Write an enzyme that holds these catalytic residues in place. Structure first.
Site, mmCIF file in Angstrom:
data_model
loop_
_atom_site.group_PDB
_atom_site.id
_atom_site.type_symbol
_atom_site.label_atom_id
_atom_site.label_comp_id
_atom_site.label_asym_id
_atom_site.label_seq_id
_atom_site.Cartn_x
_atom_site.Cartn_y
_atom_site.Cartn_z
ATOM 1 N N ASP A 1 -13.295 15.771 20.383
ATOM 2 C CA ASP A 1 -14.052 15.264 19.116
ATOM 3 C C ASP A 1 -15.452 16.085 19.357
ATOM 4 N N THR B 1 -15.114 12.556 11.597
ATOM 5 C CA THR B 1 -14.089 12.285 12.589
ATOM 6 C C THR B 1 -12.715 11.769 12.087
ATOM 7 N N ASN C 1 -15.892 8.200 7.289
ATOM 8 C CA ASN C 1 -15.728 7.268 8.181
ATOM 9 C C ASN C 1 -16.157 5.645 7.744
ATOM 10 N N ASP D 1 -11.761 18.268 15.894
ATOM 11 C CA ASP D 1 -11.808 17.763 14.564
ATOM 12 C C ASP D 1 -12.988 18.573 13.639
ATOM 13 N N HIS D 2 -13.937 18.941 14.222
ATOM 14 C CA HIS D 2 -15.246 19.434 13.500
ATOM 15 C C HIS D 2 -16.134 20.100 14.571
ATOM 16 N N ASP E 1 -8.826 21.138 -15.717
ATOM 17 C CA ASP E 1 -8.542 20.307 -14.784
ATOM 18 C C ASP E 1 -9.549 19.008 -15.106
ATOM 19 N N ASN F 1 -8.711 15.847 -15.374
ATOM 20 C CA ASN F 1 -8.886 14.629 -14.340
ATOM 21 C C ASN F 1 -8.919 14.805 -12.825
ATOM 22 N N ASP G 1 -7.737 16.526 -10.277
ATOM 23 C CA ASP G 1 -6.775 16.317 -9.356
ATOM 24 C C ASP G 1 -6.507 17.446 -8.722
HETATM 25 C C1 LIG Z 1 -1.747 17.787 -1.705
HETATM 26 O O1 LIG Z 1 -0.475 17.364 -1.234
HETATM 27 C C2 LIG Z 1 0.031 15.963 -1.974
HETATM 28 C C3 LIG Z 1 1.162 15.720 -1.463
HETATM 29 O O2 LIG Z 1 2.355 16.517 -2.023
HETATM 30 C C4 LIG Z 1 -0.001 16.037 -3.391
HETATM 31 O O3 LIG Z 1 0.082 14.800 -3.849
HETATM 32 C C5 LIG Z 1 0.947 14.310 -4.636
HETATM 33 O O4 LIG Z 1 0.742 14.566 -6.000
HETATM 34 C C6 LIG Z 1 1.620 14.045 -7.135
HETATM 35 C C7 LIG Z 1 0.774 14.294 -8.386
HETATM 36 O O5 LIG Z 1 -0.646 13.796 -8.361
HETATM 37 C C8 LIG Z 1 1.839 12.586 -6.751
HETATM 38 O O6 LIG Z 1 3.156 12.184 -7.381
HETATM 39 C C9 LIG Z 1 2.718 10.958 -8.099
HETATM 40 O O7 LIG Z 1 3.581 9.875 -7.342
HETATM 41 C C10 LIG Z 1 3.737 8.422 -7.715
HETATM 42 C C11 LIG Z 1 4.546 7.362 -6.658
HETATM 43 O O8 LIG Z 1 3.227 7.450 -5.542
HETATM 44 C C12 LIG Z 1 3.552 6.666 -4.455
HETATM 45 O O9 LIG Z 1 4.527 7.274 -3.736
HETATM 46 C C13 LIG Z 1 4.378 8.195 -3.186
HETATM 47 C C14 LIG Z 1 5.450 8.832 -2.259
HETATM 48 O O10 LIG Z 1 5.811 8.091 -1.096
HETATM 49 C C15 LIG Z 1 3.160 8.095 -2.133
HETATM 50 O O11 LIG Z 1 2.739 9.203 -1.256
HETATM 51 C C16 LIG Z 1 1.988 7.649 -2.986
HETATM 52 O O12 LIG Z 1 0.649 7.727 -2.155
HETATM 53 C C17 LIG Z 1 -0.463 7.749 -2.844
HETATM 54 O O13 LIG Z 1 -0.763 6.502 -3.420
HETATM 55 C C18 LIG Z 1 -1.325 5.485 -2.374
HETATM 56 C C19 LIG Z 1 -1.713 4.278 -3.140
HETATM 57 O O14 LIG Z 1 -0.881 3.606 -3.680
HETATM 58 C C20 LIG Z 1 -1.954 6.137 -1.380
HETATM 59 O O15 LIG Z 1 -2.149 5.126 -0.075
HETATM 60 C C21 LIG Z 1 -1.908 7.629 -0.644
HETATM 61 O O16 LIG Z 1 -3.033 7.811 -0.063
HETATM 62 C C22 LIG Z 1 -1.498 8.431 -1.946
HETATM 63 O O17 LIG Z 1 -2.745 8.505 -2.817
HETATM 64 C C23 LIG Z 1 -3.118 9.632 -3.359
HETATM 65 O O18 LIG Z 1 -2.221 10.111 -4.619
HETATM 66 C C24 LIG Z 1 -2.192 9.168 -5.608
HETATM 67 C C25 LIG Z 1 -1.486 9.555 -6.837
HETATM 68 O O19 LIG Z 1 -0.069 9.053 -6.246
HETATM 69 C C26 LIG Z 1 -3.659 9.115 -6.298
HETATM 70 O O20 LIG Z 1 -4.033 8.351 -7.135
HETATM 71 C C27 LIG Z 1 -4.886 8.708 -4.989
HETATM 72 O O21 LIG Z 1 -6.090 8.999 -5.469
HETATM 73 C C28 LIG Z 1 -4.679 9.738 -3.786
HETATM 74 O O22 LIG Z 1 -5.331 10.793 -4.269
HETATM 75 C C29 LIG Z 1 2.370 6.326 -3.477
HETATM 76 O O23 LIG Z 1 2.377 5.377 -2.823
HETATM 77 C C30 LIG Z 1 4.197 8.487 -9.098
HETATM 78 O O24 LIG Z 1 4.074 7.145 -9.650
HETATM 79 C C31 LIG Z 1 3.557 9.453 -10.026
HETATM 80 O O25 LIG Z 1 4.379 9.547 -11.295
HETATM 81 C C32 LIG Z 1 3.455 9.290 -12.576
HETATM 82 O O26 LIG Z 1 3.188 10.594 -13.317
HETATM 83 C C33 LIG Z 1 4.480 11.442 -13.822
HETATM 84 C C34 LIG Z 1 4.065 12.518 -14.402
HETATM 85 O O27 LIG Z 1 5.188 13.695 -14.339
HETATM 86 C C35 LIG Z 1 5.367 10.367 -14.888
HETATM 87 O O28 LIG Z 1 6.841 11.094 -14.845
HETATM 88 C C36 LIG Z 1 5.491 9.032 -14.334
HETATM 89 O O29 LIG Z 1 6.115 8.428 -15.217
HETATM 90 C C37 LIG Z 1 4.388 8.461 -13.699
HETATM 91 O O30 LIG Z 1 3.832 8.196 -14.818
HETATM 92 C C38 LIG Z 1 3.337 6.658 -14.705
HETATM 93 O O31 LIG Z 1 2.130 6.397 -14.229
HETATM 94 C C39 LIG Z 1 0.973 6.923 -14.655
HETATM 95 C C40 LIG Z 1 -0.202 6.439 -13.955
HETATM 96 O O32 LIG Z 1 -0.046 5.027 -13.733
HETATM 97 C C41 LIG Z 1 0.864 6.454 -16.451
HETATM 98 O O33 LIG Z 1 -0.321 7.221 -16.858
HETATM 99 C C42 LIG Z 1 2.026 6.698 -17.176
HETATM 100 O O34 LIG Z 1 1.788 6.102 -18.587
HETATM 101 C C43 LIG Z 1 3.261 6.204 -16.437
HETATM 102 O O35 LIG Z 1 3.460 4.764 -16.542
HETATM 103 C C44 LIG Z 1 3.472 10.873 -9.410
HETATM 104 O O36 LIG Z 1 4.780 11.426 -9.379
HETATM 105 C C45 LIG Z 1 2.336 12.095 -5.427
HETATM 106 O O37 LIG Z 1 2.229 10.773 -5.046
HETATM 107 C C46 LIG Z 1 1.244 12.808 -4.365
HETATM 108 N N1 LIG Z 1 1.248 12.454 -3.000
HETATM 109 C C47 LIG Z 1 0.242 12.117 -2.125
HETATM 110 C C48 LIG Z 1 0.490 11.749 -0.836
HETATM 111 O O38 LIG Z 1 -0.848 11.827 -2.557
HETATM 112 C C49 LIG Z 1 -1.413 16.750 -3.850
HETATM 113 O O39 LIG Z 1 -1.232 16.826 -5.390
HETATM 114 C C50 LIG Z 1 -1.856 17.935 -3.404
HETATM 115 N N2 LIG Z 1 -3.076 18.358 -3.779
HETATM 116 C C51 LIG Z 1 -2.971 19.691 -4.303
HETATM 117 C C52 LIG Z 1 -4.559 19.852 -4.935
HETATM 118 O O40 LIG Z 1 -2.426 20.529 -4.457
HETATM 119 O O1 XHQ Z 2 -14.808 8.991 17.901
HETATM 120 C C1 XHQ Z 2 -14.991 8.214 17.130
HETATM 121 N N1 XHQ Z 2 -14.568 6.739 16.883
HETATM 122 C C2 XHQ Z 2 -13.370 6.072 17.673
HETATM 123 C C3 XHQ Z 2 -12.843 6.437 19.049
HETATM 124 O O2 XHQ Z 2 -11.606 7.030 19.118
HETATM 125 C C4 XHQ Z 2 -11.132 6.985 18.187
HETATM 126 C C5 XHQ Z 2 -11.958 6.079 16.946
HETATM 127 C C6 XHQ Z 2 -9.636 6.372 18.573
HETATM 128 N N2 XHQ Z 2 -8.871 7.908 18.075
HETATM 129 C C7 XHQ Z 2 -7.781 8.485 18.793
HETATM 130 O O3 XHQ Z 2 -7.429 8.190 20.124
HETATM 131 O O4 XHQ Z 2 -7.574 9.890 18.048
HETATM 132 C C8 XHQ Z 2 -6.061 10.446 18.454
HETATM 133 C C9 XHQ Z 2 -5.490 11.345 17.225
HETATM 134 C C10 XHQ Z 2 -5.408 12.520 17.564
HETATM 135 C C11 XHQ Z 2 -4.867 13.322 16.553
HETATM 136 CL CL1 XHQ Z 2 -4.638 15.265 16.340
HETATM 137 C C12 XHQ Z 2 -4.821 12.965 14.900
HETATM 138 C C13 XHQ Z 2 -5.077 11.448 15.051
HETATM 139 CL CL2 XHQ Z 2 -4.681 10.582 13.482
HETATM 140 C C14 XHQ Z 2 -5.437 10.935 15.931
HETATM 141 C C15 XHQ Z 2 -10.010 8.254 17.646
HETATM 142 C C16 XHQ Z 2 -16.341 8.562 16.292
HETATM 143 C C17 XHQ Z 2 -16.862 7.504 15.637
HETATM 144 C C18 XHQ Z 2 -17.607 7.691 14.786
HETATM 145 C C19 XHQ Z 2 -18.360 8.752 14.705
HETATM 146 N N3 XHQ Z 2 -19.434 8.977 13.695
HETATM 147 N N4 XHQ Z 2 -19.894 10.240 14.132
HETATM 148 N N5 XHQ Z 2 -18.982 10.604 15.189
HETATM 149 C C20 XHQ Z 2 -18.318 9.664 15.481
HETATM 150 C C21 XHQ Z 2 -17.199 9.779 16.390
HETATM 151 CA CA CA Z 3 -15.137 13.468 15.177
HETATM 152 CA CA CA Z 4 -5.488 18.134 -13.534
HETATM 153 ZN ZN ZN Z 5 -19.685 12.584 15.656
#
Ligand SMILES: *[C@@H]1O[C@H](CO)[C@@H](O[C@@H]2O[C@H](CO)[C@@H](O[C@@H]3O[C@H](CO[C@H]4O[C@H](CO)[C@@H](O)[C@H](O[C@H]5O[C@H](CO)[C@@H](O)[C@H](O)[C@@H]5O[C@H]5O[C@H](CO)[C@@H](O)[C@H](O)[C@@H]5O)[C@@H]4O)[C@@H](O)[C@H](O[C@H]4O[C@H](CO)[C@@H](O)[C@H](O)[C@@H]4O[C@H]4O[C@H](CO)[C@@H](O)[C@H](O)[C@@H]4O)[C@@H]3O)[C@H](O)[C@H]2NC(C)=O)[C@H](O)[C@H]1NC(C)=O
Ligand code: XHQ
Ligand code: CA
Ligand code: CA
Ligand code: ZN
Ligand code: NA
Ligand code: NA
Length: 805
Positions: free
Chosen positions: A121, A159, A180, A308-309, A683, A685, A687
């Site tokens: 870290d 972190t 964080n 990490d940084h 762009d 939206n 994204d």
């Molecule tokens: C970096 O890499 C990543 C990974 O490859 C790229 O992200 C992918 O981009 C895709 C496009 O933006 C996106 O595809 C969508 O998937 C939808 C299903 O999503 C769920 O399932 C997946 C797979 O398991 C899962 O990973 C998702 O996880 C996301 O969401 C949860 C929250 O529920 C989060 O915990 C998680 O962190 C992640 O969040 C991120 O992505 C979402 C978008 O999914 C953002 O909203 C967040 O802010 C955050 O960034 C999900 O659990 C699917 O539903 C989508 O399909 C819609 O659109 C198409 C258009 O072609 C259409 O065909 C469908 O009908 C549907 O439209 C309908 O819904 C619309 C909105 O509700 C509505 O307007 C319409 O009218 C329709 O009803 C879409 O296919 C994919 O999920 C993500 N994956 C991840 C992990 O993020 C990313 O683009 C890369 N970045 C760059 C810059 O290159």
């Molecule tokens: O260190 C901090 N916080 C706590 C202490 O240890 C944590 C959370 C448990 N974890 C762990 O054992 O990491 C293993 C791992 C490796 C990979 Cl390669 C990928 C992933 Cl996902 C995890 C990290 C912390 C908090 C706040 C701050 N503000 N400034 N500086 C800060 C530092």
């Molecule tokens: Ca750190």
């Molecule tokens: Ca866009």
């Molecule tokens: Zn720190």
């Protein structure tokens, strides 16, 4: 509730987590307040410390001891890590010559080289050189294995966003750990470092490496360690797991150190107190390597040493307070520190207005040490907007500073001297990467790269298929001896039309005018040649870009430039041209100031018109191929074609004209010619991905001409600048940008001054990878070069950062 009355007897550091309310014996039980009653006694033994001494050698086994020095310890897998050195006359790993690891040398029963990630870290990249005298184990890993001079973290350089990006290959906006501290308005829930909400799986998106491995039948050690488990016990636990039977043994492990971050915050990145934490991290690496050598695994396992940084000097006195800017400071909630995020304190307050907050925070004090942005206007390279957990108003804080809401927040929360979180191109924020083992190269330096790329490589080292992520798989193939991933270029989806002369001038009714009706077989044949592509090899150096979605577009050739003209968006998707070192800059002649010319290759119905610009009082136009760089007065007319025109706010035209009139020729002079590809990006939206037609929020008034959100340029030349850009035999050099297309220059506090004092500074802030432009445009560049495809993938992930050495 936990029934802590079960027992850890034979379960110490078990890998499978048992569910509530049964008590736990895993490496995270302490963090959940759930360990069994006898976990400390059985699992955290400390008796007689961590090192064998001569008198302990061949001792009778005493199960109470933290580690063992009895004859049986190697077969039990629980010797102290220095056992063979003290008791069996062996050397420390650090004292052995390095010897190339050409193949894995693994014990029988090993299906694959294990991977051990050793994460540190706050380990700033320059510690590798500046601390090398006190870190001999790390220095041997670095010098004998594969290392980069630094590795770029993701923004914010905090972190948990970084650790989870290492684990997933995703930007924070996609994996969801965007700071964080976070508020999610859909959950109505807050994530904090202290407490229980942070363990809820709904925070953690994507698919981290341990889950990727498990789903594909590769067992994983648990990655997180409770803070109270000492480092020596973490190392001993890893070494014990590595002695499990084949069918039970994990193939991927993580060790974490809270240092040097912990001390860096207290003492600053180079405080004299920092030497001891570096020595103690090195001693831990030493324990692990000696431990691997004892197990005959030191030429079998791949080790990644990664941070990490970094860490910057930051003290309480360098804090900006929003209370010195805002009248309404009590109506906002600020997430403070080395970045700021602002949202309304109450969703019931209808007097809250983001526009007035931004304006109140914009260029108000001469030396102001932060800059406010709506998140969609942040540099696209940060990829920090597409998540509802990221507040609309962001403050980019200068390195060495903090932002806070009111002075009382800073003294009623100086303690600290170091912090991190700033823009991930800042030198102090950069961190470390070393890879050592049979799968990594020997004594090899690789160029800096981004941490989003590592997940794919970790997958490659383990024979796993990576989940979809933001790495570019194959761009880090040059780190690897074997297990490289050999991608194919994406297939072109839309093929271009190649229109010839199909329309008469009078068919157009665009409201445009040009003084070009002032008029030879010696020269008429030649201009026909140019329109068929006779100069294309000069101006299209790396093949035409491939269009990777379905659309209708035309290739248009000219003496000085080539373009891919979209019939849907009414403008080029890309415009390509080469400017040699010898090129001359000219003016736009007086008689041509307002000249726009119908293109008799493209129908009136698929053209822009000048009347729309006349009527839109906010919008003007510019050209993608610049008239300033025409090869002759006659070729200059091509630059005024309606098919080379794009919509530009007057404020943006100041930026664009200076780039085209001054900076392109400066780059060609400096780089021995440049090839430029420029174009629009939409762009709306935010994204990071190309908009479809139906996502466009703004058109030139009265028309179907869409307004770009950004304009990009990709500027390529020969890495060996003794060769001109158009006659380059070897590797390429690139820099690119994605400039926001904004109707004011409020982002640039000095914009009242001559462009020579602020434009290039703006462009540097909006530096970009070619891959960022690919995502934003659906185009695929560098399709026809003499270079290997993996080398081209590395080139497309390059970011020119403009930071000093
Ligand atoms: C970096 O890499 C990543 C990974 O490859 C790229 O992200 C992918 O981009 C895709 C496009 O933006 C996106 O595809 C969508 O998937 C939808 C299903 O999503 C769920 O399932 C997946 C797979 O398991 C899962 O990973 C998702 O996880 C996301 O969401 C949860 C929250 O529920 C989060 O915990 C998680 O962190 C992640 O969040 C991120 O992505 C979402 C978008 O999914 C953002 O909203 C967040 O802010 C955050 O960034 C999900 O659990 C699917 O539903 C989508 O399909 C819609 O659109 C198409 C258009 O072609 C259409 O065909 C469908 O009908 C549907 O439209 C309908 O819904 C619309 C909105 O509700 C509505 O307007 C319409 O009218 C329709 O009803 C879409 O296919 C994919 O999920 C993500 N994956 C991840 C992990 O993020 C990313 O683009 C890369 N970045 C760059 C810059 O290159
Ligand atoms: O260190 C901090 N916080 C706590 C202490 O240890 C944590 C959370 C448990 N974890 C762990 O054992 O990491 C293993 C791992 C490796 C990979 Cl390669 C990928 C992933 Cl996902 C995890 C990290 C912390 C908090 C706040 C701050 N503000 N400034 N500086 C800060 C530092
Ligand atoms: Ca750190
Ligand atoms: Ca866009
Ligand atoms: Zn720190
Ligand atoms: Na106008
Ligand atoms: Na300004």
């Amino acid at each position: 509730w936990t029934a802590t009355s079960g027992s850890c007897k034979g379960r110490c550091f078990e890998l499978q987590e048992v569910g509530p309310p049964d008590c736990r014996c895993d490496n995270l039980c302490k963090s959940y307040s759930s360990c069994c009653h006898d976990f400390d006694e059985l699992c955290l033994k400390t008796a007689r410390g961590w090192e064998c001494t001569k008198d302990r050698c061949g001792e009778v086994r005493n199960e109470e001891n933290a580690c063992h020095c009895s004859e049986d310890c190697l077969s039990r897998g629980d010797c102290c890590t220095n056992y063979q050195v003290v008791c069996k006359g062996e050397s420390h790993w650090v004292d052995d010559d390095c010897e190339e690891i050409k193949v894995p040398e693994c014990p029988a029963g090993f299906v694959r080289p294990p991977l051990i990630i050793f994460s540190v870290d706050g380990f700033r990249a320059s510690y590798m050189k500046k601390g090398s005298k006190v870190m001999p184990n790390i220095e041997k890993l670095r010098s004998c294995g594969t290392h980069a001079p630094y590795m770029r973290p993701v923004y914010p350089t905090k972190t948990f966003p970084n650790l989870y990006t290492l684990a997933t290959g995703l930007y924070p906006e996609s994996h969801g750990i965007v700071g964080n501290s976070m508020y999610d308005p859909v959950f109505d829930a807050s994530f904090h470092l202290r407490g229980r909400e942070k363990f809820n799986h709904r925070w953690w998106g994507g698919q981290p490496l341990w889950i990727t491995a498990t789903k594909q039948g590769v067992r994983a050690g648990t990655f997180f360690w409770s803070v109270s488990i000492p480092h020596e016990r973490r190392i001993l636990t890893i070494l014990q797991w590595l002695s499990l039977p084949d069918n039970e043994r994990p193939s991927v492990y993580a060790f974490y150190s809270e240092q040097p971050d912990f001390s860096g915050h207290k003492y600053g990145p180079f405080g004299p107190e920092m030497t001891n934490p570096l020595r103690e991290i090195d001693k831990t690496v030493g324990q692990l390597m000696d431990g691997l050598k004892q197990l005959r695994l030191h030429r079998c396992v791949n080790v990644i040493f990664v941070g990490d940084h970094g860490m910057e000097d930051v003290t309480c006195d360098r804090t900006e307070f929003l209370s010195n800017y805002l009248t309404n400071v009590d109506d906002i909630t600020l997430v403070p520190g080395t970045l700021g995020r602002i949202r309304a304190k109450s969703i019931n307050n209808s007097k809250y207005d983001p526009k007035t907050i931004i304006a109140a925070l914009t260029c108000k004090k001469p030396d102001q040490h932060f800059k406010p942005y709506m998140k969609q206007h942040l540099p696209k390279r940060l990829h920090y907007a597409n998540n509802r957990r990221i507040e609309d108003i962001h403050l980019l804080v200068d390195r060495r500073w903090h932002v806070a809401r009111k002075p009382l927040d800073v003294y009623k929360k100086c303690f600290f001297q170091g912090d991190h979180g700033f823009d991930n191109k800042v030198n102090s924020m950069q961190t470390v990467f070393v890879g050592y083992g049979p799968t990594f190269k020997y004594r090899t330096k690789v160029p800096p790269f981004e941490n989003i790329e590592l997940y794919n490589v970790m997958c490659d080292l383990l024979g796993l298929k990576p989940a979809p992520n933001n790495g570019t798989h194959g761009s880090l193939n040059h780190l690897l001896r074997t297990n490289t991933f050999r991608p194919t270029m994406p297939d072109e989806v839309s093929r271009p039309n190649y229109p010839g002369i199909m329309y008469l001038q009078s068919e157009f009714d665009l409201g445009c005018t040009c003084d070009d009706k002032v008029e030879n077989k010696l020269e008429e044949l030649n201009k026909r040649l140019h329109t068929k592509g006779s100069t294309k090899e000069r101006h299209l150096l790396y093949g035409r870009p491939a269009v990777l979605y379905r659309t209708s577009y035309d290739i248009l050739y000219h003496t000085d430039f080539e373009s891919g003209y979209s019939e849907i968006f009414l403008m080029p998707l890309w415009t390509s041209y080469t400017i040699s070192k010898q090129a001359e800059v000219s003016s736009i002649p007086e008689h041509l100031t307002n000249c726009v010319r119908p293109d008799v290759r493209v129908s009136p119905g698929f053209s822009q018109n000048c009347l729309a610009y006349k009527n839109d009082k906010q919008m003007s136009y510019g050209f993608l191929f610049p008239p300033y760089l025409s090869s002759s007065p006659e070729a200059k007319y091509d630059a005024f074609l309606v098919t080379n025109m794009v919509p530009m706010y007057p404020a943006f035209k100041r930026v664009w004209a200076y780039f085209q009139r001054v900076l392109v020729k400066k780059y060609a002079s400096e780089r021995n010619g440049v090839n430029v590809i420029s174009g629009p990006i939409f762009d709306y939206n935010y994204d990071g991905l190309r908009d479809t037609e139906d996502e466009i929020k703004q058109y030139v008034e009265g028309s179907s001409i869409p307004v770009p959100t950004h304009y990009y340029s990709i500027i390529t030349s020969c890495l060996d600048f003794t060769q001109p850009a158009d006659k380059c035999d070897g590797p390429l050099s690139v820099s690119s940008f994605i400039l926001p297309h904004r109707p004011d220059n409020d982002e640039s506090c000095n914009s009242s001054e001559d462009e020579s004092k602020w434009v290039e500074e703006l462009m540097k802030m909006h530096t970009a990878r070619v891959r960022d432009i690919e995502h934003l445009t659906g185009l695929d560049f560098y399709r026809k070069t003499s270079r290997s495809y993996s080398e081209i993938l590395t080139l497309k992930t390059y970011l020119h950062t403009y930071e000093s050495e």
